[PDB]
Write a protein that binds this ligand. Structure first.
Ligand SMILES: Nc1nc2c(ncn2[C@@H]2O[C@H](COP(=O)(O)OP(=O)(O)OP(=O)(O)O)[C@@H](O)[C@H]2O)c(=O)[nH]1
Ligand SMILES: Nc1nc2c(ncn2[C@@H]2O[C@H](COP(=O)(O)OP(=O)(O)OP(=O)(O)O)[C@@H](O)[C@H]2O)c(=O)[nH]1
Ligand SMILES: Nc1nc2c(ncn2[C@@H]2O[C@H](COP(=O)(O)OP(=O)(O)O)[C@@H](O)[C@H]2O)c(=O)[nH]1
Ligand SMILES: Nc1nc2c(ncn2[C@@H]2O[C@H](COP(=O)(O)OP(=O)(O)O)[C@@H](O)[C@H]2O)c(=O)[nH]1
Ligand SMILES: [Mg+2]
Ligand SMILES: [Mg+2]
Lengths: 430, 95, 439, 51, 433
């Protein structure tokens, strides 16, 4: 009961899923054939949260897979745990977008929406009770970011009363991947912010920062990035699947991290994260948990969290540990950085506990905090967006499929409307 | 042979007192736990121990615990009863 | 022919109910399955368990409880746990969707489709009895789900069951230790819910529990499960006078007639002692003179309020154990002689003392050690103003910028409700001051 | 002095017995009585059973 | 129904308090474990009943550092002391007179004073307070002075006793005792009624002259002082034809409100190797008790004057011999009494024989006498410190580390003034009318 379904978009959305079920599969004890081989009874009591029931006793993830080209889609199935997805669920086109957001928002993405929305509706309806959707895509792809959001807006117009979790990746300035990134990344923020409830941001630049600074391995591959991101996702729903002292559903985390409907941005991070060297050099004690939780280098988001001031945050411990230290240890952090906390919001940390910890360690914690420092990511991207527009460079693509320049201007103000409006509360005083 | 755990207000350190958690007991019971090895040790997990979680495996049962305490008590003073004779005890040179 | 049922709402309410039933269990020797021991083949006598149990003619004994909650995981655990064969299978109604600290969600939208069954469940257990004396309510304010369904329950019961008295031991937000980030709302609005519709409520701030545990139990790393047990012993002593025969009973109806002077001022907090760990208990004689003296020790009050800042007006003390009345008289006088603790001018007598013979029953593997003497308190003092006044500061500051007000508006709650709430709480702060001035 | 060493350890045990009343009056010949024996401080308890 | 509270503060006081319990413990037959041997209210004086079996000695130990306290918590006496009455902190004062009275002391007394209060409530017959402390350490005065200063305002007229330990005239441990001692003397002069000098140096001479042991350790010293308490208190809880109570003390050894320091001596102290060779005559035992060398403190009584002496006889002493014992003393010219006090003795007869500790030094005897007496010769002890103390201040060396702890510079000014004030008066009593 109180379950949600999953929807992904694009190669980055496709690839990220490949491990999320891989990471989820080991903890839930699902073998790659879909048969149960678990060792604990509770490993099946709440199994309905992410698996349905069918003939033969084998379970299948209730995911929706959707793409505009066949290379990525066919690729996933052959990977580990890649056979879990059902065949009927897949729906794909035959055109190809190629980072042209306008291509992915009006013509190619919209045309095929009929099935993708249809495959969405069937899955949700059959449940006993829907809880919401979790969305993971990337704003760096016109087909993805464009057709990624277009599905997003329609979902809201069909179901207003359900929460909607959002995951994605945005391009950092120093590390660049596409010269046409700013246009599609920033536009999608316009539609998302008008509909997205919970935050969606995670920065790759800090993703690799954690890759070498903490993990200290020599040459990471795309395997590492998928591993760290998925585990964090498992943290969001950790207590929603197993018993705990004070469970923390999405809404409860939703209920305690959104000061206002529009300021819906969070930065996520995972701890503890140590390399083979300190696996048994370090001691897993509560002082380590907090100490590595609020520091920047563990924060996977590019925004520096020490150049702003927190408005509120909450934590989700995993594993069994006496609560007391959970109470005061969070209390100490809330003062010893006295200035680091905005003044008008008293008692701005939310806490919870989970008893069954993710495999690989006896205890873990996930960070979810809405830090006004996020403005840096927009401003750095915001600066780029305006620059590429004045010279009328690359305006030919998007204007060739029914999109006018009036819309671009509006998005320009709104985002700057957000940044201008976001900074006001940071210095707010009572 | 020591004394198989200490009194409440004793300064110092007790083997696995900050490395394997051990949250939940008053203190006298915790103290005895450390010396006679009974706890996982190491950042690892035996499948059985995962899944004791609180409500499902503790604060429940009934009389099974009662036989546990009686067995536990007998082995604290009984090792401590290893002293007799009308000569008091080695206060002169033990300090 | 004395009956009292339990009403439980909220995760904090459910677990506290979990411990209390067990504490009732080991007290009388009834096994989880309903057969008393696997051996006791005489019975048919010593009618004492009727107070918290009802006979089935032969076999088990059904607790006088009805479990409600807005979350499925916590409730589902109770059924699949080790007591699966004790609670009534169909009395543990559970919902489908959570409230998630949205009081507006918990008081206007979702609680309505669960209360309807709630009356049915209550009416079923109440009728079977014949001498319904009182109702016990454990509701966690610091969670809206605890508030709404918990709050509504006090309202609905206020219009059907008539004049029957009701009791409640609440749990309000801590002074500095914080649990949620929306507690100030659910805390402030809730107070209005029970102020005009509850007979009696008690202060059980969790922080004091943490501190209380460390100073005597010797636990530097206590968790919740320790916290719940200590609470039940508080419940155990107060209700113990209703099922163990004694030289002087104190009827459940006979507290609020002596512990509430006016309709408005209806909040009392309690304290517990002695509480001593296994490594140190036997070392002390636990004399009566010392036990009561620690009772007023300002550092050991169960909730972090400063009674030294004011006076006392109403308090009734229950003794259980082997104490003798001589012990009672001397202890009180020494209090009257003291100067650190004073009394209001208009309450020349302020000691309502009860005595019980049966010793409080000790649990296996619990924090407490074996003990014989035992005395619990329910004291009113002007010092309770601190909790609300300090929170009174808390509610406004957030409301100044109406942050987080956007959600509570949309769940159907009118904007004006927050307007009235601040006014009533003001009067209570205003009301408390007036009684505090001597004639 | 009230004994202490006994009633910190030897209280859990409790004995129950059944018997029939004896006396001159024929009014009390066929009912049933239960005698309870606590081993702590030498206490005797009696109850009346009613079919 | 008569009780006395023991307050031990200071590491040096710690073990001595530790030492004083083994002798006390073995006199009433209470085994170290705590269970009574099996078989009369005479034990009520230094002990209280816990309800069944063991007992709780009325103990309160204090020392800012845990090492010394831990050992007693880990030795063979674990089950006797109350589990939580050994108040212990986190950091040491480091011998400074200030950190123990202006930096760290207050953070413990709050847990401390409350411990003192309860011990009385459970009782009914508080007779007086005995305090043991070490001057030669920063902690000793700090916590010790604070309690005595604090204890003067919580109970009032109820008396208190203290056995201090100042530095030896030529044997010392550190270079900071001359300062920390002088300031401490300021505190006790206005918060304690009576105290007896027990300077350590003389003990080594005492130990070597009779026991015939050439490698004494600190433990051996403690036992002597530990037994010293017994005779001072032994009369309290034993049957006797003529007893002396705790309160019946200040009326005989306090010639005036200010001078309340007296130096004691103990005997006979004869090793078991040669304790059978002499008759141990009461006449001879007393005479050795007054010999200048055996004086328990390194302050020669011969150099000074005499005002009043109260001594106790324990064993089987026949009263008439004591009457014949005192008479001869008046004749001698070695000790010449006093002009305005023709009589300065309060005779006490106590019955039970002093006990013997196994494996120690003391032998078993049926006669002995202990003394607690004052004299003007005590004017030497402060002068020797007085001469030293002024020496250092000429350059203020080590003062900067006393002000930097919050102690005012003027404080040192006032302290040395009072000592002089006490110094002059002693000249007043010694001058005949
Ligand atoms: N002292 C103590 N308080 C508890 C405990 N469990 C829950 N609480 C209180 O409960 C409040 C939150 O509600 P919970 O009891 O956790 O759960 P709930 O009753 O369903 O309320 P929601 O969390 O909103 O669903 C917290 O602020 C705690 O103060 C406990 O074990 N000990
Ligand atoms: N009679 C006796 N005196 C001692 C003993 N140990 C130390 N002293 C004296 O105490 C003086 C130093 O003070 P201590 O009591 O030892 O130490 P302290 O009081 O704990 O002061 P800190 O060490 O700073 O905490 C030394 O000069 C010794 O003369 C002992 O075992 N027996
Ligand atoms: N860190 C990480 N980023 C990825 C991965 N796959 C894709 N991305 C991001 O996705 C962007 C390219 O997405 P693209 O496939 O062109 O978007 P689409 O055309 O809409 O499907 C890049 O900027 C990457 O940052 C991955 O495996 N790891
Ligand atoms: N002959 C004789 N005199 C005694 C005896 N006991 C005490 N005294 C005298 O009584 C005096 C002490 O009196 P004391 O007991 O102090 O009186 P109190 O202070 O009022 O109790 C001494 O000087 C003795 O001479 C005794 O048993 N026989
Ligand atoms: Mg809940
Ligand atoms: Mg020291």
């Amino acid at each position: 009961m109180r379950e949600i379904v999953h929807i992904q978009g694009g190669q980055c959305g496709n690839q990220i899923g490949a491990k999320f079920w891989e990471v989820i599969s080991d903890e839930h004890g699902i073998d790659p054939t879909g048969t149960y081989h678990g060792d604990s009874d509770l490993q099946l009591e709440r199994i309905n949260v992410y698996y349905n029931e069918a003939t033969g006793g084998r379970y299948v993830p209730r995911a929706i897979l959707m793409d505009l080209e066949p290379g990525t889609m066919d690729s996933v199935r052959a990977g580990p745990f890649g056979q879990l997805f059902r065949p009927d669920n897949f729906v794909f086109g035959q055109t190809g977008a190629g980072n042209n957001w306008a291509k992915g928002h009006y013509t190619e993405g919209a045309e095929l929406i009929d099935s993708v929305l249809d495959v969405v509706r069937k899955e949700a309806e059959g449940c006993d009770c829907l809880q919401g959707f979790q969305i993971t895509h990337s704003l760096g792809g016109g087909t993805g970011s464009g057709m990624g959001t277009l599905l997003i807006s329609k979902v809201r117009e069909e179901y207003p009363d359900r929460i909607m979790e959002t995951f994605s990746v945005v391009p950092s300035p120093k590390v660049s991947d596409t010269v046409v990134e700013p246009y599609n990344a920033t536009l999608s923020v316009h539609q998302l912010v008008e509909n997205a409830d919970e935050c969606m941001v995670i920065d790759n630049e800090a993703l690799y920062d954690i890759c070498f600074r903490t993990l200290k391995l020599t040459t990471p591959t795309y395997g590492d990035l998928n591993h760290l991101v998925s585990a964090a996702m498992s943290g969001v729903t950790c207590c929603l699947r197993f018993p705990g002292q004070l469970n923390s559903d999405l809404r409860k985390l939703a209920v305690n991290l959104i000061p206002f409907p529009r300021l819906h941005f969070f930065m996520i991070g995972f701890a503890p994260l140590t390399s083979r060297g300190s696996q048994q050099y370090r001691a897993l004690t509560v002082p380590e948990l907090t100490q590595q939780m609020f520091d920047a280098k563990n924060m996977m988001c590019a925004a520096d969290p020490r150049h702003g001031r927190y408005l509120t945050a909450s934590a989700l411990f995993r594993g069994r540990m006496s609560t007391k230290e959970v109470d005061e240890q969070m209390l100490n952090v809330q003062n010893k950085n006295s200035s680091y906390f905005v003044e008008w919001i008293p008692n701005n940390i939310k806490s919870s506990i989970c008893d069954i910890p993710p495999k690989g360690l006896k205890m873990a914690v996930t960070f979810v905090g809405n830090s006004t420092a996020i403005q840096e990511m927009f401003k750095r991207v915001a600066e780029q967006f305006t620059a590429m527009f004045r010279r009328k460079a690359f305006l030919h693509w998007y204007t060739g499929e029914g999109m006018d320049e009036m819309e671009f201007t509006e998005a320009e103000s709104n985002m700057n409307d957000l940044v201008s409006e976001y900074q006001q509360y940071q210095d707010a005083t009572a | 042979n020591q004394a198989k755990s200490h009194i409440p207000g004793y300064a110092g350190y007790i083997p696995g007192i900050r490395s394997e958690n051990m949250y939940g007991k008053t203190y006298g019971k915790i103290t005895y736990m450390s010396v006679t090895n009974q706890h996982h040790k190491g950042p690892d997990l035996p499948p059985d121990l995962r899944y004791t979680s609180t409500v499902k495996g503790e604060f429940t049962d009934q009389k099974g615990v009662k036989k546990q305490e009686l067995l536990r008590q007998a082995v604290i003073e009984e090792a401590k009863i290893t002293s007799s004779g009308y000569g008091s005890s080695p206060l002169r040179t033990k300090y | 022919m004395r009956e009292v049922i339990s009403i439980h709402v909220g995760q904090g309410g459910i677990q506290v109910g979990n411990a209390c039933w067990e504490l009732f269990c080991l007290e009388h020797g009834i096994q989880p399955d309903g057969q008393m021991p696997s051996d006791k083949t005489i019975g048919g006598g010593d009618d004492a368990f009727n107070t918290f149990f009802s006979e089935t003619g032969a076999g088990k004994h059904v607790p006088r409880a009805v479990f409600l909650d807005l979350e499925p995981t916590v409730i589902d655990e109770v059924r699949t746990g080790t007591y699966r064969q004790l609670f009534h299978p169909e009395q543990l109604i559970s919902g489908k969707e959570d409230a998630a600290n949205n009081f507006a969600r918990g008081h206007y939208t979702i609680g309505k489709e669960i209360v309807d069954l709630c009356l049915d469940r209550i009416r079923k257990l109440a009728d079977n009895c014949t001498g319904l004396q009182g109702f016990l309510v454990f509701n966690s304010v610091g969670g809206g789900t605890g508030s709404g369904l918990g709050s509504l329950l006090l309202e609905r019961l206020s219009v059907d069951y008539g004049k029957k008295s009701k009791l409640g031991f609440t749990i309000y937000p801590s002074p500095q230790v914080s649990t949620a980030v929306v507690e100030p709302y659910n805390s402030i609005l809730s107070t209005h819910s029970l102020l005009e519709h509850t007979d009696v409520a008690v202060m059980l701030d969790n922080e004091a529990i943490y501190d209380i545990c460390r100073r005597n139990l010797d636990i530097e790393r206590p968790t919740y499960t320790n916290l719940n047990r200590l609470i039940a012993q508080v419940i155990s002593s107060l209700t113990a006078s209703l099922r163990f025969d004694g030289a002087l009973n104190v009827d459940i109806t006979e507290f609020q007639t002596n512990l509430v002077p006016y309709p408005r001022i209806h909040f009392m907090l309690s304290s517990y002692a002695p509480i001593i760990s296994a490594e140190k208990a036997y070392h002390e004689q636990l004399s009566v003179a010392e036990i009561t003296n620690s009772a007023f020790e300002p550092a050991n009050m169960m909730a972090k309020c400063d009674p030294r800042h004011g006076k006392y007006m109403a308090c009734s003390m229950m003794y259980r154990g082997d104490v003798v009345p001589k012990d009672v008289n001397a202890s009180i006088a020494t209090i009257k002689t003291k100067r650190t603790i004073q009394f209001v001018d208009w309450c020349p007598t302020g000691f309502k003392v009860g005595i019980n013979y049966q010793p409080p029953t000790v649990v296996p593997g619990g924090d407490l050690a074996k003990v014989m003497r035992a005395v619990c308190m329910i004291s009113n003092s002007t010092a309770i103003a601190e909790v609300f006044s300090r929170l009174d500061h808390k509610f406004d500051l957030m409301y100044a910028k109406r942050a987080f007000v956007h959600w509570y508006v949309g769940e159907g709650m009118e904007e004006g409700e927050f307007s009235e709430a601040r006014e009533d709480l003001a009067a209570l702060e205003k009301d408390y001051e007036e009684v505090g001035i001597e004639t | 002095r009230k004994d202490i060493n006994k009633m910190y350890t030897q209280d859990q045990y409790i004995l129950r017995f059944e018997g029939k009343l004896i006396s001159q009056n024929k009014e009390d010949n066929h009912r049933k009585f239960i005698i309870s024996f606590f081993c702590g401080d030498d206490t005797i308890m009696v109850y009346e059973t009613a079919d």
